[PDB]
């Protein structure tokens, strides 16, 4: 565009879609889970994926993935939710932190331990 | 309509230089004459003269091509233009091809090149780049 046009209207930057809106600008949000249930991934992949439906202190209902090989969680469990996109799942945007609040660290972990809330063996 | 005689002058020069024309005819203006004088002194053109036409004077610029037909002007750019006019402080004068080209600066002292302007410590309007 001509300079006159720029002077008249200007440049308008692309608006940024606010990601991870349900955290309300927090790094993590505490939540109580209503359902725990397995879910199917998108067509090329096939698995039973452990997922919880979590009511956050932000007053938003969210679906959260449960990372790790084995979980303790059931209804009314208190979990800490962080951001985390699981490509396979269609609507899932948040992951539950292992090792925080009611969620136990996954048993027999020896590598990547800090990401799964397992203490070092003595 | 005609809106920038100096841009027209530079593009007539550029197009004839591409076509390997030996001469360029222009409608005369005192500002075009002074630019042509600078181009002669800096070695980008061979010579120029003022002739008469039916209604006004004409500028004839003779282009300079070296042995093996090699263009003496590599590039020609209109910098200040109507509306978006460009002015430079004497300390911010533009460099053309890292200093191997010439910037033509209109000054209260007259038309000068970036080199002259910086020595005299004067700024002005940046008319064109030549390299």
């Amino acid at each position: 565009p001509t300079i006159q046009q720029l002077v008249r209207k200007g440049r308008r930057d692309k608006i940024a879609k606010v990601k991870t809106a349900a955290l309300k600008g927090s790094p993590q949000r505490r939540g109580v889970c209503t359902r725990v249930y397995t879910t199917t991934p998108k067509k090329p992949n096939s698995a039973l994926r452990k997922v919880a439906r979590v009511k956050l202190t932000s007053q938003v209902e969210v679906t959260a993935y449960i990372p790790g090989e084995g979980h303790n969680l059931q209804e009314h469990s208190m979990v800490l939710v962080r951001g985390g996109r699981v490509k396979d799942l269609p609507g899932v945007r948040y992951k539950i932190i292992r090792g925080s609040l009611d969620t136990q660290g996954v048993k027999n972990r020896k590598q990547a331990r800090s990401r799964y809330g397992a203490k070092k063996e003595k | 309509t005609m809106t920038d005689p100096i841009a027209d002058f530079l593009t007539r020069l550029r197009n004839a230089n591409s076509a390997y024309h030996d001469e360029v005819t222009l409608p005369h203006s005192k500002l075009k004459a002074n630019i042509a004088e600078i181009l002669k002194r800096e070695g980008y053109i061979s010579d120029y003269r003022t002739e008469d036409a039916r209604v006004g004077k004409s500028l004839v610029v003779q282009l300079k091509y070296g042995p093996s037909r090699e263009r003496s002007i590599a590039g020609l750019r209109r910098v200040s233009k109507p509306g978006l006019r460009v002015y430079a402080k004497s300390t911010n004068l533009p460099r053309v091809l890292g200093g191997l080209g010439v910037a033509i600066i209109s000054t209260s002292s007259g038309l000068l090149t970036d080199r002259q302007a910086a020595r005299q410590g004067v700024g002005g309007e940046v008319l064109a780049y030549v390299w």
């Binding site: 300079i3 006159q4 002077v7 | 509306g83 978006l84 006019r85 460009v86």
Partner: protein, 48 residues
């Protein structure tokens, strides 16, 4: 970097009504003579 032309209205005091519509006038700042008014008419410079 384009030079932009902008126009500002001003309210000026003249005691005698010597400057009519369309005329070119010189003004000088003064203290507040009322809300808005902060200019006085010095000289009607070129009438038209």
């Amino acid at each position: 970097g384009k030079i932009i032309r902008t126009t500002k209205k001003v309210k000026a005091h003249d005691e005698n009504g010597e400057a009519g519509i369309g005329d070119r006038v010189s003004l000088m700042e003064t203290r507040p003579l009322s809300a808005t008014k902060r200019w006085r008419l010095v000289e009607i410079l070129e009438k038209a």
